[PDB]
Structures are given as structure tokens and as C-alpha cells.
Amino acid sequence: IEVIPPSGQWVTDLADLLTPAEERMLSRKLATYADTTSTQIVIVTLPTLNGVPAADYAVELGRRWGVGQKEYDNGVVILVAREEREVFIATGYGLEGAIPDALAGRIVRDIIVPRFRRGDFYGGLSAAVDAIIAAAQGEFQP
Ligand SMILES: [Mg+2]
């Protein structure tokens, strides 16, 4: 599997879902969380996965980019595959148990997808970040 190379960005919006101001606001939140906790959460948006499963892509991007390694200790990839209408939340092994499949799925189904169907990409991703941070803190309360 070949994924995109490391961007150096908290938000890599290759589907161009977000305005620059929306990217900068998400990026500030993500960077601040990483600074305080050493947990690196990144957002990647892609026009298409070209037939690669979202799970496989998210895991390879976390590996290739070293998400949650190097300067950081734990990692999350939020991968948005626009053509396939998939959102895959991938956590590093360190965070095993913090976001089970049902909690990730409920973030996608109930938090992200209804916002995305209205064109509210910033709100859906912002709320997903907040839910991920709450879950990583042991404080997610659906
Ligand atoms: Mg953009």
C-alpha cells in the first residue's frame, strides 16, 4: 500500500473540505493537545482511496508518518475518504481501549456524518476531535 508522504501538518486537507481559517483553528487545537499530553492527533482528508480499504490506509499512514512516535508518545489518525464516504479513526497501540469500535462508530454516525451531509465539515471534524480528546482523557460521556 502507498499512502501520501508525511505532510508535517496537523490538518492535511487534500479533499479541500475546509477553509484556511477552519484548518488553522483545528490545527491550533490539535497542536495544543499534543503539547500538553504528548498525544498527536492528525486529520487527513483525501478525495479517494482508489480501492484501498480505509483501515489499511489509516494504519499505513500512521506508520509511514510515525504518528504518536518521535516527539510524541500516543497517536490518532482521523482519515476522511470523501468519494467512499468513509471516516476511519485509527489509534496507536498505546491508546488501545480508549476508543473502541462502537465509540469511533458513534462519533462517525452521530457526530460527523450529519454535519458533513449539511456541508459542515469544520463542525463535524471539530466535534470528532473533542470526542477523541475526551475519550483519551477517560471522560467521554455520550
Ligand atoms: Mg482546505
Q: How far apart are CA 89 and CA 104, in angstroms?
A: 6
The approach used to solve this structure was X-ray
Tell me how far the alpha carbon of residue 97 lies from the centroid of ligand 1, in angstroms.
Answer: 32
Q: Separation of 74 CA from ligand 1 center, angstroms?
A: 26
- Gap from CA of 72 to ligand 1 centroid (Å): 25
Place of cell 462508530: 105
Choose among 12, 61, 33, 30: nearest CA to 126.
30
Rounded to the nearest angstrom, the distance between the alpha carbon of 32 and the centre of ligand 1 is 20
Q: Ligand 1 center to residue 42 CA distance, Å?
A: 14
By C-alpha distance, which of 60, 7, 68, 45 is closest to 125? 45
Distance CA 69, CA 25 (A): 24
How far is it, in rounded angstroms, from Cα 69 to Cα 75?
A: 8
Give the residue from 82, 68, 134 showing the smallest Cα distance to 112: 82
Q: Which residues of 53-77 are buried (b: 16+ CB within 10 A; e: fewer)?
A: ebeebbbbbbeebebbeeebebbbb
Compute the distance from residue 95 Cα to the ligand 1 centre, in Å.
Answer: 29
- Cβ atoms of 81 and 46 closer than 8 Å: yes
Domain ranges of the chain: 1-142
Cα of 14 vs centre of ligand 1, distance in Å, is 7
